[PDB]
Swiss-Prot record:
<comment type="function">
    <text>Component of the FACT complex, a general chromatin factor that acts to reorganize nucleosomes. The FACT complex is involved in multiple processes that require DNA as a template such as mRNA elongation, DNA replication and DNA repair. During transcription elongation the FACT complex acts as a histone chaperone that both destabilizes and restores nucleosomal structure.</text>
</comment>
<comment type="subunit">
    <text>Forms a stable heterodimer with pob3. The spt16-pob3 dimer weakly associates with multiple molecules of nhp6 to form the FACT complex. Interacts with abo1.</text>
</comment>
<comment type="similarity">
    <text>Belongs to the peptidase M24 family. SPT16 subfamily.</text>
</comment>
<protein>
    <recommendedName>
        <fullName>FACT complex subunit spt16</fullName>
    </recommendedName>
</protein>
């Protein structure tokens, strides 16, 4: 029931494994990003739809094309060992004698005998001892279950024999540069996001406000989210989505909706239970296509006043300059500082209101934290990277409000972009001029 077809792509597995190995075997990277490990240990437990974003599961998606629950990988420079169930293992078997192999492929099959299975785990420990005993791990990852429990039973008592180190960033560097298929996936996701936004959301939003509909943000948000189960919606032709495999579509997160003078410009914002107010309305939404993430976010103004329109137009102008700065060879922290600098030159008054970062990288993971766009990031943008770019202003105080009105507002723009050898590609682009996103009572 709902049994899928899996095409394990042996070519892409070795291409990508080799990218990883080349960097690990680089003296610099090996010392810096991989912290001088001789092995990388990666485990994935039972499926947990509670954290969809992990280095561990991203590794799976990147190497194998899919997440394999309850499996263990031990990467070595000369060999990759994957320990899984017989049925999963048989799928991976084709990786083991490809002519274009990047490494030895060592597949260990879990059976139905506890003791044998234990012997398999014990092999892993033995491989590690034969090394410098520095083991690369992804420390922020968390997993759980039966498989994991067995592994712990075996590893934890012998674990002090080893030196566990963070090789997180060596993977990050690999994942950061997207190939042609990956970019395609992210563009697809982006296309769905912006279509839902431009078409479903703005429609709902505008009629609600118009028709004085009393709806909570959470209600509305949940309404949006439930849209995914309505495939009729995605076949709407005006949505030029005809080429999207709807069965490979998911939400990145629960859409964030905000109004009525209470805002949170962090992607971790949870949509409250307060009623939608027709003043300044923020929306963030993103889809995940074939396991690649996207994000879009927009501001809508209802009967905005002059200073509100001015601030919103300045944000648009700022984001434009942001795109322009996002080019191959640019230092990330310079980009932030240059934007801050534009504020101080033209709208210094706005500086206390300015976001502390401008988002981060995006791909398999919703957030590639190595590519956090803040002042301190010394990393350099390269062609083929993808960014989930966020820019905005918070706690903007309304000067003169009659008391049927919100004291404060915020402004936000998010788009997903690809770094090129020139100007970036803004996959999630849509008209965002004040006139596009402004509504005036009486239908103006």
């Amino acid at each position: 029931g709902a049994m899928a077809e899996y095409e394990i792509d042996e070519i892409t597995f070795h291409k990508r494994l080799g990218i990883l190995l080349t960097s690990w075997k680089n003296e610099e990277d090996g010392k810096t990003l991989f912290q001088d490990c001789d092995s990388i240990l990666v485990t994935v437990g039972a499926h947990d739809d509670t954290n969809p974003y992990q280095k561990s599961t991203a590794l799976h998606t990147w190497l194998l094309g899919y997440e394999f629950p309850s499996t263990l990988i031990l990467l070595e420079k000369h060999r990759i060992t994957i320990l899984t169930s017989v049925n999963k293992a048989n799928m991976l078997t084709k990786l083991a004698e490809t002519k274009g192999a990047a490494a030895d492929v060592n597949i260990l099959k879990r059976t139905k005998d506890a003791e044998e299975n234990k012997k398999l785990f014990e092999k892993i420990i033995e491989y590690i001892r034969a090394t410098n005993k520095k083991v690369g791990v992804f420390p922020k990852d968390k997993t759980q279950g039966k498989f994991i429990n067995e592994w712990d039973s075996i590893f934890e008592p012998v674990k002090s024999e080893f030196n566990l180190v963070d090789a997180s960033l060596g993977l990050a560097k690999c994942l950061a540069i997207k190939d042609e298929q990956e970019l395609a996936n992210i563009k697809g996701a982006s296309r769905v996001s912006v279509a839902v936004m431009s078409k479903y959301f703005v429609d709902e939003l505008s009629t609600y406000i118009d028709q004085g509909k009393k709806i909570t943000h959470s209600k509305f948000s949940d309404q949006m989210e439930s849209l995914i189960d309505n495939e009729a919606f995605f076949q709407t032709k005006s949505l030029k989505l005809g080429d999207i495999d709807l069965d490979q579509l998911e939400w990145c997160y629960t859409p964030i909706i905000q109004s009525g003078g209470s805002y949170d410009l962090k992607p971790s914002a949870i949509t409250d239970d307060r009623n939608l107010h027709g003043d300044v309305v923020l929306c963030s939404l993103g889809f995940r296509y074939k396991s690649y993430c996207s994000n879009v976010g927009r501001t809508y103004l209802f009967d905005p006043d002059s200073e509100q329109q001015k601030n919103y137009s300045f944000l648009v102008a700022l984001q434009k300059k942001l795109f322009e700065y996002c080019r191959d060879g640019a230092v990330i922290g310079d980009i932030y500082t240059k934007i801050l600098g534009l504020i101080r030159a033209k709208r210094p008054d706005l500086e206390p209101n300015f976001v502390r970062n401008l988002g981060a990288g995006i791909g398999i993971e919703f957030r590639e934290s190595s590519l956090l766009v803040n002042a301190k990031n010394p990393r350099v943008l390269q062609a083929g990277m993808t960014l989930n770019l966020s820019i905005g202003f918070g706690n903007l105080i309304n000067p003169h409000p009659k008391n049927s009105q919100s004291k404060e507002y915020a402004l936000l723009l998010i788009d997903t972009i690809q770094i090129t050898r020139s100007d970036p590609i803004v996959f999630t682009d849509s008209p965002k001029a004040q006139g596009d996103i402004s509504y005036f009572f009486g239908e103006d």
